[PDB]
Each structure stands twice: as C-alpha cells, then as structure tokens.
Design a binder for these strands. Structure first.
Lengths: 93, 80, 96, 104, 104, 93, 80, 96
DNA sequence: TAATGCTTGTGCCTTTATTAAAGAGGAAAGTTGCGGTGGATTAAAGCACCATCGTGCGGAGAATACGATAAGGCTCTTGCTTCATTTGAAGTTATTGACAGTTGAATCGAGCCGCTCAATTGGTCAATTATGGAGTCAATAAAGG
DNA sequence: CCTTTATTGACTCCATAATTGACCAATTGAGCGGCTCGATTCAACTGTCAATAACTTCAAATGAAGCAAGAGCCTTATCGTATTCTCCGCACGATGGTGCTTTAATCCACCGCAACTTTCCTCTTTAATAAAGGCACAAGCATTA
C-alpha cells in the first residue's frame, strides 16, 4: 500500500525558507508527526466547537476559533492572519 | 475599573493559606499570590471570552467558563 | 491580659477553615477584578452571575492547592514560614 | 484542472486535507473554506519550525537538519515550548543548562 | 413494550444511552450490546460513589448527602481519587490534613 | 426546552443502596455532571479505539476496552464484571 | 526472567543524573530511581498491552506504545 | 600521581552528557526488564523492536526530567547532593 | 602567576550508507450536475443584566508589645568522588525456522432508516420536613503558675 | 499537676425553604419491516521474532585514599503574630430600565453523492556526497606549587 505523508510539501517549504539546507529522514519523520499532531488537535477542537453550538458543519470560522484556542499568543495571531489571507485569496479568485 | 487586584485583601490571602494548612506566612506572599492569581484569571477568562465570541454572544455564561476550565485540565462539577 | 502564645491561633484557624465550605474571598472585589481583566480582551462584556461564581470557585480551589504545594516546599527546606521562593519552586515543578 | 493549493497560493495539499477532514467524521458537513484555512495554518507552523531548525543547524555549523536541531529550536522559543511542553523528540537531547550554585 | 433497561435488569436508561451514542457521531454504527454495557458501567460507578457518599453522610450524623460528603468520599478512596485527581467539586471543601511537623 | 438528566435513575440507585438517606439538589447535580463526564470519556475513548482498527462500528468489546483503559484497577475490574453480566442477561433472554 | 531491574546498573543511573545536571548523588538514589522507573514502565506497558490485546494481536508494535504514551500526556515524536 | 579534586570530573561529565543524543541505558538489560514486566500482564508476548526502542526513549526522557526536578528540589534546600526525599517531593508536586 | 597533566576542540582522508534523484502507474483530486438541507436574515418577546439608592454593621487597616524563628558561623565526621585492577557480560555477525500478521473472498448476520404510538418523563405547582440561625450549656484545650 | 479563660461541640427551639410528590403533556423508546454492508471464518503467503552459537573488549564491580559537604549546635535580631481601636464599604433589599437571547418563519445557496477524466504522488531502483570514524594535533582548564 502507498503511505501518505507530508514529506514533499515540507521539503518544498524548506526549500522556500532555506534554499541551501537539507533535511535528514529522521527530521522529516519528526516534522510529519508534528504536523499530524497539530492537524488532529485542531480537528478535534473544531469538532467540539461545532458540537457545542449544534451546527453540523465545520467552516473556516470554527477553524479560526480552534486556532485561537489551541495556539498560544503571537503564534496564534500569525496563524490566524495567514489563514485569513489564504481564504481571502481563494475566494477572490 | 482598574486596580481591583488590591481588592484581594491580605486577610483573604491569609484565610486561603490557612485553608491550605499553612502555619506562618511571609510578607511577600501577598504580592506573589496576587500575581499568580492574576495570571490564572487571565488565562481562564481569555479562553472563556473566546468561547463566548465564537457563539456570537455578548454575555459570558457559566458553560463558557466550565469549558475553558476543562480545556486546562481543571474540570469543575456543580455548574453544568 | 491573657495573650495566646504565637502560633496557636494559627493552628485553630487552620482547623476551622479546613472544616468549612464557604468562599474566603469577598464576592464584589473578585467580580470587579474579573470584569477589569476581561476588559482587556473584549470591551462591553456582560457576565452571567453563575460565570463569576464558577470563576471564584475555580480560583479559590487553585490557590488552596498551590498553597498546599507551597507548604510542602517550605517544610522540605526545614522551615514553617512559606516564602516567595517556595511558590516559585512549586509552580516551576508543576510546569506553570 | 487547477489544484486548490495553487488556487489559494499554498504549498500544502488543500485537497488532501479536505479529504482527511471528510473522512475523520468530525462533522456531517465540511465547508469549502475550512481546508484552505487549515492548510494555511499548517503551512505557517511548518515554515516557522523549519526556519528555527535551519537557524539552529547553521549556528552549529552543519548544513543538514537533524532531530537535535529541532529539539533546540523548540526549546529555545517560548511559544513553541508552551505548545510543545509535553512533547519528547527522539534523539533530541536536552538544552545545556548548569545551575549557578553548582559552578566552582 | 418491554423497556431494555428492565430487559437487561438495569436501572439506567439503556435506550437513552443508545440514543446518545448514536447522536454523538462516535461511529457510523453502534452495536446492540454496547449501550447495555455502557449503562451497566455507569450504574456501577454511580452506585459506588453514592454508597461512599452515604457512608460519609452517616458518619457525620446527617441524613441528606451534600457536596461535602461527595468530596470526602472521593478523596478518601484511592481509586476514585486517582480517577478524580484533577477535579474541583463546588462547595466540597478540603480533607482536613495538618502536617505532623506543624503540631506543637 | 426539556432538559434531559439522570436524576430519576440516580435517585433509584440511591434508594437501592441507602433506603433512608436523601440527597440534596446540589449533590444530585454534581453526580449528574460526574456521570456525564464519565460517559463522554468512555465514548471518545471507544471512538478512538474504533478509529485505530478501521472498524466503522462500536460494540461491547470497544466499550470493554475503553473501560479497562480509562478506569483504574479494581474499579475497572468490577466495572467489566458488571458490564459483562448485564450483556449476558440482555442476550440470554 | 527475574531481578532484571538490577540490570539498570549504577553507572547508567549516574549517567542519566549527569545528563540532568546533577553534580552529586546520594547512595539511595539508585534504589529510588529503580522503583520509579519500574512504576513508569508498568503503567506504560499495561496500556500498550491493552491496546495490543484489543486488536487481537500477539505482538506489541511501536504504535501501541505511542498511543499508550499519548494517553498519559507524553506524546513521543519520531515513531509514527 | 595527578588527581582531580572532587567535583570537577562530575562537571565535565555534566557538560559532556548534555551535548550528546545517545541512549545511556544498555539495550539488552532494558529489553529483558520490559519483557519481565510485560510477562505479568499477558503471557507469551512478542515485542516489535521499535516498540522496545520507543519504550527506552520514553523512559530515559522521563528519568532525565525527573532528575532535573530533583536537582531543583535539592538546590532549594541549600544542598548539592540529591537525596531520596528530593525525588519524593518532586513526584509529589508533579501529582504522581 | 606557572609548569604540566590533561581532556576536549580542531584539521584532514576514507567510506558508506544515507540522502538526493528518476520512473511506472495507479490512486486520488478536479469537474459537472442536481437538490434539499442548513445557514443567513428579520421580527418579536421576555427575562436577565446593569446602574441607582439606602444603611448598618462585621470585617479590614493601622499601631504596639514581643518572643521565637530564620539565618549566620564553627566544627566534625562520614559519605561520596576519583583512580586503578580484574573481569564478565553486552555488542555484532551469521543462521534457521516457524509463528503470526496480512491480504482476498463468501457470506450470513445485523444494524441503519421509516412510520406509528404511547408511555415515560419533564415543566409546573403544593409542602413539610431536614437543615440554617439564634441562644444557652458543658466539654476541651492552652497558658501562666 | 492546677486554675482560669477563651473556644467550640452539643443541645434545643423556631424559621424557612426546598426537596419530595402529584399532574398534564410531549416527545421518544419500542416494535415491525426492508435492505445493503461488514465482520467472521477460512486460506495462503510472507515478513520477522525468537533462539542459537561464537568472539572480542570495553564498561561494570570492587577496593583505597582522602576530603569537603551535610548536619548538629549556639547566638542573635528582626519580623510575623496576637490584641485593640477606629472606620468603611460590602451585603442585602427594592427599583426601574433596556438590550440581547432565544424562537419562529422564510429564502437561497451550497455541500454531499455520483461518474469520468487526468495527472500527481508514491515504492522500486540508482547514485553521490555529508558525516561518522579514525588519526594526528593544538589549546585552554585544573591543579599543586
């Protein structure tokens, strides 16, 4: 079976940030596990948010509130800014 | 509506310490306790206000506080 | 005038306040403090009374637990008076 | 057949994340804008961690990121350390810290 | 119309618990035997806690269980105290404990 | 709206255990919150168990494993015994 | 298999303490550390064995250990 | 014969072992211990190698953190030697 | 300071195995289409949240006398560190075998979805009894003699 | 031990409110039915976990020597504690306004389901070079003088 991971996208981000720095396989796996953990945290938190207000749909608003509740401080603010920028760019095109 | 941290008087801190089994209390314990209480309240109220804001409300309910507490591993019964 | 030697009245207060379930912090100052703290997150907030009551219960329980840990830290160092360094150590080990 | 990732200007797989959200049964319905937001947030977090890890690798005078550099980057930043307080990195080591009262 | 509660010999609402499990979207399907098991477990836990609380109330020369008795029962039993270590119970008070080194 | 609670069943259990002991409303609410908390814990743990093994269904086996994983020691043993007894009674008649 | 807890030698405990910043070590630290390590391993292995038993397997995999650790708030990275 | 005064070699070991990522406990004794412990829960168990490796990593990280907390407790009491009471206090505050 | 042990940091060659790179094809993303179900909008009630006012009384702030607890300094002895010798068990390599995890099908059992119903339970009103409050007595414990 | 005195548990009586009970309805558990899928059992393959043997050699066990750190003891001074006095603002009771929370109805728009295409990512295979390892070497720290 094919195993699905974020290795390609993480490598693309690394090349965007550090053009001349490479990454080992162990660090790649650790980053993949970190991203999976964050994805799961945000998903369960957004599901709880939807359950509390009796809405059957997860929207960008639930994701934004999950980001605010889970990530701390400046990290959460920057994440919210980036997400809002991405959603605006997706909608305006 | 500011400086209400001094509203937590010294006898109140002494009573809270006595409830905890403390026999003698130093002089700087009052300031230290005020600081730590302010930090705790800041965290809990931040989470509760976020929960209230998500529901498009303007009034903070007890359920928001209960959820904010449960987020930090401090589940509280009697307010469900 | 009969004066109790220092320390016995503290022991009586320890015995008495551990027996009761009453809240030790006055309600109105705590309410004002909560409103002031919340003013920095979102202006024009209304508080349901049960929310402030729950906040007071949680804060008092947290402070009692912290003071128990502080007393353990103070006893560990062969003292009976709790000090700011005891609170700092207790919060450090708890991960706060 | 334009991909949603390039439609929103992202590197992460908006489509794959949307499929993950659908399969996880977190809710009956998933909005169209939710996976884009989630992909952007994950991309930002990965970029931040990788930037700090590359910085740690450079200050060590290596040209490859290893778990030690990830551990150092995580424990040298207050926000990530708050987010990753309970997280143990395999082969991460520890931050070198010797207490003052132990010094000669 | 025989209720499943008395069909299985329980007091708790097997039907209500089944409806809660189905509504919570914990899985696409729930077995016929799962709500009965869950109802039995919840009934046992409630019976244990209530028996300890009633014993605590009786030891205090009282007739009605109050939150103080629940707190005392929880903190006097090792198993529940391990299960309920992080729990704050409203109006529960604390267990009377004075360190031996503080005594005169 | 009609609020659904376990007050009646908790009172029946109390009368079964302590015939002459009553319970105040505050203690009843605390017991209700305790039962809701335990229900939620077991439900999410069983959902995770089903997710790990890719089974779309929750059965009594998932509940039993959730009980053995969440409750500690002799409490978990007795809970498992009671659950098995109830399931056998339900199935055998 | 018996008394393999003594397989955690004194130099190993000294090295673990040194990694933690400890300058001097008492004599009973070795026994105390052996006891606490045995308790931790008992808890984690119990949870891992329960996870393995549920899946109707006979071999404990790394994923079971990772799940058991995550259940206790000690998520481990690099074994996914 | 040149002898180092006590404490300097300990400081050098502290500096050296904090720089490395190697595992400090030997693999085979830890594997035997893990199998012995698991024998009490279910007989005839097989262990995947990565499972034992993960167990060793987790145990070593936990012990390092516990020893850091123990060192803080020992320093609090104006000592440089860690003692069993320090470990007991640290575990008590952590809630274990 | 100062010479010297001395362990650690630094510079260079090797290889290898660990990471960068190319391909087949298949497995999943994008598109079109439909439609009903969920979300956004609007009007209305009703209760709940806030601001005002009065008082009066128990709890908080401020001195004051003081004694006992934390802190500093000295001494000692004993427990822990450093060094050296011997050894014994972990580490690495190669081998075998059989047990168990996994994938693929058939399939028969079983749980989801509709419709009815009606019976159990939840909102609302009555109450008397267990507990709260006040007053008094006896028992308990502490402090100076 | 003793005696006085401050403090609290018990005891009793009255108030009170609140927990138990009865009742109307409402909504939901139960029964029957149809039907698609899923989880059970069987089978084979195949991956690897356990057990074996062998050799090396470095890390663990043990013993000596010694020294410095933890603990005990004395002294002091200063700082938290207990008691009293004054006052002040929290708690309780009433009020009145309004805003904002919840509910009901409507409309529209958007996301799930399905089939088809297509193109992107993922095991398998190939290589090339970064770093561990080894070897030689410089260099700042520790130590006794």
């Amino acid at each position: 079976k094919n195993v699905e991971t974020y290795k390609i996208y993480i490598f693309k981000v690394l090349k965007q940030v550090h053009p001349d720095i490479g990454i080992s396989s162990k660090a790649m796996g650790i980053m993949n596990s970190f991203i999976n953990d964050i994805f799961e945290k945000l998903a369960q938190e957004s599901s709880k948010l939807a359950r509390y207000n009796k809405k059957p749909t997860i929207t960008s608003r639930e994701i934004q509130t999950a980001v605010r509740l889970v990530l701390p401080g400046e990290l959460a603010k920057h994440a919210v800014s980036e997400g809002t920028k991405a959603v605006t760019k997706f909608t305006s095109s | 509506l500011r400086d209400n941290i001094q509203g937590i008087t010294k006898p109140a801190i002494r009573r809270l310490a006595r409830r905890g089994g403390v026999k003698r209390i130093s002089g700087l314990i009052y300031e230290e306790t005020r600081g730590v209480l302010k930090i705790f309240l800041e965290n809990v109220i931040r989470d509760a206000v976020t929960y209230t804001e998500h529901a498009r409300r303007k009034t903070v309910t007890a359920m928001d506080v209960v959820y904010a507490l449960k987020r930090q591993g401090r589940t509280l019964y009697g307010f469900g | 005038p009969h004066r109790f030697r220092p320390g016995t009245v503290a022991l009586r207060e320890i015995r008495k306040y551990q027996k009761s379930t009453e809240l030790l912090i006055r309600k109105l100052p705590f309410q004002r403090l909560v409103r002031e703290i919340a003013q920095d997150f979102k202006t024009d907030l209304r508080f349901q009374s049960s929310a402030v009551a729950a906040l007071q219960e949680a804060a008092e329980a947290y402070l009692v637990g912290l003071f128990e840990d502080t007393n353990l830290c103070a006893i560990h160092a062969k003292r009976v008076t709790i000090m700011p360094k005891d609170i700092q150590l207790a919060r450090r080990i708890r991960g706060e | 057949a334009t991909s949603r990732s390039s439609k929103a200007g992202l590197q992460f797989p908006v489509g794959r994340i949307a499929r993950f959200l659908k399969a996880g049964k977190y809710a009956e319905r998933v909005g169209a804008g939710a996976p884009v937001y989630l992909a952007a947030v994950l991309e930002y977090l990965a970029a931040e961690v990788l930037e700090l890890a590359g910085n740690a690798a450079r200050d060590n005078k290596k040209t490859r990121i290893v778990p030690r550099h990830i551990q150092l980057a995580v424990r040298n930043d207050e926000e990530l350390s708050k987010l990753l307080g309970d997280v143990t990195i395999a082969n991460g080591g520890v931050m070198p810290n010797i207490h003052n009262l132990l010094l000669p």
